[PDB]
């Protein structure tokens, strides 16, 4: 699973 | 430069009207075609150039996981290393050609703190997403995204509110980083954590859609955290 | 042909592959490569030929219909109109490409009614999408989608059972072509109608998964009617 | 808006 970074 | 006999203000109308078409490999390339007339970008303009190779490294950061896993599970004939091989390739070529826009040469002529942020922080981006796929020169390709995001940490702490959406969404990437490339999980947490405490303490300081933009970053911030710990 | 190289089985399993990293323009020029090796296609080769140059089609007829939508408000610079073109040049390209396929050799070489009809099919919905573009020679291409969609009815009325899948999306995509291309849209109903009704009673003699397939289908039929009547 | 058809 990939964590939250900025954009899309 | 494909791109070179179209008019700067073209290619920006190109790109836009790309991504109303989720042609995001266009728009990339309409982008580049407009940062090689060597003119800086505008605010709107990073921002699409950012958003074109974000979706296209996007697009084959998935593909190589989803083909890195096969791989792995096969593990435990030649063509899925060689196909994964392939999808890294373009990958790491995606990565190369905004390294060398940053380098050729939006990054020497950035002295605004919210241009020179920005590019640093791409280039913080897309050396971890060659870290991602590296395994031998991966410990200076993760030295190199380690400088340029703290090169743009520096700056943003000197130059930029803690709510300006930029410093956010750099200090959300390099926890990333941290946590993800740099296996240094609590370094991570205590950067989100920093971030997220000191932009709260600034939004009282914001208009109602300033407000509303830092705080969707911060979502992002306190998503990362709850998984975290 | 750049795959002329890769061994026909390395090819199909590539597509596979492709087709599980989402990565659909690879996985149709491997299934391009491996109908280049001359050999005719199983089942479901066939299949993941289509599916591939579906997905890679289906993306610019999304594109193009966004820039054509687009062009029309402006109408009521060049740059639309010529970004536009370059879309529709590039669709026109792929479904040269699949014509071709179809043309040097596959449906020459068919001689099972159940590839034979995949083929014709495939041959008038590669037509339909040139149609879809298309303003001058519109009328013989319209012409050429037509001629291929009876053929193949003609042979899957007399080959096929009225439950055959490939005989429900045959006469899905060509009660389609009626209504959107033909503007013959009572066409269109009535065989949307006689196809489902003939399928619906054909269904007791179907295994449990047969009926799930071939229910799959007829429930777009009726998704169609609904919107139709 | 589109009309279904078989397939992706
Ligand atoms: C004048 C101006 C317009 C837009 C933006 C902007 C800011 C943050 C994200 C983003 C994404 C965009 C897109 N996906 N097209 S534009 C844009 N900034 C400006 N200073
Ligand atoms: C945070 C943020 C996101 C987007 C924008 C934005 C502004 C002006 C135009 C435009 C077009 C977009 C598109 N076509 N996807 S996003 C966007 N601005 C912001 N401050
Ligand atoms: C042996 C065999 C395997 C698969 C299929 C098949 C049938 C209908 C649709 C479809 C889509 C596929 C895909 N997206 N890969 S395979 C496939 N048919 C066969 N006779
Ligand atoms: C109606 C139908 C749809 C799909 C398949 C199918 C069969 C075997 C393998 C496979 C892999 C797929 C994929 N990787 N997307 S679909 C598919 N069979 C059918 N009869
Ligand atoms: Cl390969
Ligand atoms: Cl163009
Ligand atoms: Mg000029
Ligand atoms: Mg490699
Ligand atoms: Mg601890
Ligand atoms: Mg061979
Ligand atoms: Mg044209
Ligand atoms: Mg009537």
């Known amino acids: 699973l990939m964590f939250k970074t900025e954009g899309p | ?229």
């Open chain 2, 1 to 229: 430069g494909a791109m070179g006999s179209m008019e700067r203000a073209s290619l920006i109308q190109k790109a836009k009207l790309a991504e109303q078409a989720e042609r995001y490999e266009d728009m990339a390339a309409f982008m580049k075609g407009a940062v090689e007339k060597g003119e800086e970008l505008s605010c709107e303009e990073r921002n699409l150039l950012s958003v074109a190779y974000k979706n296209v490294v996007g697009g084959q950061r998935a593909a190589w996981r989803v083909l890195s896993s096969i791989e792995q599970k096969s593990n435990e004939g030649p063509e899925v290393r060689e196909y994964r091989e392939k999808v890294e390739t373009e990958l790491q070529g995606v990565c190369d050609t905004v390294l060398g826009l940053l380098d050729s040469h939006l990054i020497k002529e950035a002295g605004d703190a919210e241009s020179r942020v920005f590019y640093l922080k791409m280039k913080g981006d897309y050396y971890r997403y060659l870290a991602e796929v590296a395994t031998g020169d991966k410990k200076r390709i993760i030295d190199s995204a380690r400088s340029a995001y703290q090169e743009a940490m520096d700056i943003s702490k000197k130059e930029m509110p803690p709510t300006n959406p930029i410093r956010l969404g750099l200090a959300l990437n390099f926890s990333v980083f941290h946590y993800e490339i740099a296996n240094s999980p609590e370094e991570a947490i205590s950067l989100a954590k920093t971030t997220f405490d000191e932009a709260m303490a600034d939004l009282h300081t914001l208009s109602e859609d300033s407000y509303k933009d830092s705080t969707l970053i911060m979502q992002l911030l306190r998503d990362n955290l709850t998984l975290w710990t």
